[model samples]
Target: EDGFTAEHLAAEAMAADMDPWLVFDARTTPATELDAWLAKYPPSQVTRYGDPGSPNSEPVGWIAVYGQGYSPNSGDVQGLQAAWEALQTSGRPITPGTLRQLAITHHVLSGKWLMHLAPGFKLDHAWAGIARAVVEGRLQVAKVSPRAKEGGRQVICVYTDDFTDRLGVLEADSAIRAAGIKCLLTYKPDVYTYLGIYRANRWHLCPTLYESRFQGSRVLDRANNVEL
Candidate 1:
């Protein structure tokens, strides 16, 4: 139900009065380079779902990244949409680099990938450990999802870009587990689409995510330190 379409992303951008240049999930960008490119670009806006009229209503959450720079009458949205649709026909996973290529060809801004870390650990311990890992060059990005619900289960997902490296995911998972921080690795379909959410027919759904579907899947189950 959380699935979203490119039209949905464009409509949201239109509603927000911003030119939708690109729609993207954070999984495609490397954790280290995400902020750099974002800072280098101009007018990047993330969707904030909440009651605009209610002062006390917090944003539900944001799932995708929208880059805006195209002029009001550029007509680039359709072109971008067509390009996006064309990519889906191939049934290949769209990475950040591919999106960047589209941005270059279409003369528009680009969006990158994002990762999510489930929250159930002590803040102090979690931040301390995660920050250390990040500083030590073991992980990248820690964008926090304040409110996230998967199949009715509430969780605050800490977003990251540490999954492109298959081994990196397992290594990071191992580090977290060894640190005594209890957490679970779950597949989030949102990271696989251009609109930053799941779409049945239009997404690049892999048979198995990152060599395994869960933290302790066969890949990790059989992997040893320096042996995987």
Candidate 2:
């Protein structure tokens, strides 16, 4: 399906299955340009956060994003819990299971609609890929049961010190590689952004970008690329 249609179907299905929770369009817009883009396009639909088109705009409803924090014990737990509680009190529980169920249900609905709207749309395996991405992508961070520790699961922080140079991206790549993990480092010309370590094989929990510095020189220093 075309990008726009895919997004619309995804959002609509999501909104219906998880009613009261807005499902905003999740386009791959850059963080820097998000505000400007929203200003121009004005979200055509309501999201869990809020109506991007409305005057009383708020974040999409009942949604959460996961990422690692600086300390293992302190990472995202506190924030995630607080958000979870808030959403629960707001009438919907945003637990991992509920999120998965919502995604799966939405995909099923999407598949049904796709069969009619886009005749050639393959219903089989369509939801599989999307569900897998959603589940595996956030599995690590959403872990909260006591059994988590039984599997050698512990959180770690990702920081700029984990990279080769304070501002460089190579060191982080190297660290991930040394841990027997595969990684890639790419640089975009227009932007000074250095994308590193696309973890295609492993499940990623909390992914983060951090910046740090040393006193005088701005050369290579300690760094980490911790992932769960």
Candidate 3:
């Protein structure tokens, strides 16, 4: 932990054949002022839109417009496996039918905790990856929100009742346009399809994913907003 430098970051990038930019995820291995150099702040008009999390966790500075992110494939995959196992641990219900879609979406979001806290970590992750790093003491999480004094209203998860796949960034175009909101949508690639895809784990498992998972979550407002 003490013997790290950008030079090592370059070497690590070479060993993995990854672009130098990808090394930012390796903040798990160390920290430096480069955070300021690489920090990306997105402008989403939603409340509490950005969080500079605790150490080892990736700072979420942007509202991934369209929420470019999703899942499945093969037997022993990473993110999907983490979610699957998290389902058992989470106290969430299911339809027991498709098993592909959750009985509710938060199950998917909450389930990612497993992957974030996996034993032999440092592997690239989905949303759970960020959750894991923060929960496991990798990132600098902002102070948890305090109880509302007298809540009025704030934020909306457009895609919660709409469709978002990869863009518009997670099918957000329609949601954002229809909702008259400017929530950020986030996206990612190489989503596992077998984690819950209707298939057996196999050597031929293809991890390629074209769609994204748009949680449309920010500041955990839906629960409070509805009551307001």
Q: Choose the strongest candidate by lDDT.
A: 1
Please give each candidate's TM-score: 0.37, 0.16, 0.20
Ranking by TM-score: 1, 3, 2
Q: Clashes in each model (backbone N, CA, C under 3 Å)?
A: 9, 15, 43
| Selected candidate, larger lDDT, 1 vs 3 | 1
Model 2 scores a TM of 0.16
Instruction: Report how far residue 220 has shifted in candidate 1, in Å.
Output: 6.2
How would you encode candidate 1's per-residue C-alpha lDDT over 1-228 as one tens digit per residue? 232777777566565323222222234433455344333321112223333342214443422231222222322455766787798789767764475455445544322222333333343244434434443444433333333222122222323332344555556556555544554444231223433444453444331232223344333321122223
lDDT of 1 at 170: 58
lDDT of 2: 0.26
Rank by lDDT, highest first.
Answer: 1, 3, 2
Q: 57-173, model 3: which lDDT tens digit per residue? A: 332222222111212222234455566578657765633222435322323321110101111111111222232233333332211111112322222212221111222232333
Q: Pairing residues by index, what is the TM-score of model 1?
A: 0.37
Q: By summed lDDT, which 10 consecutive residues of candidate 1 come out lowest?
A: 40-49
Best by TM-score: 1
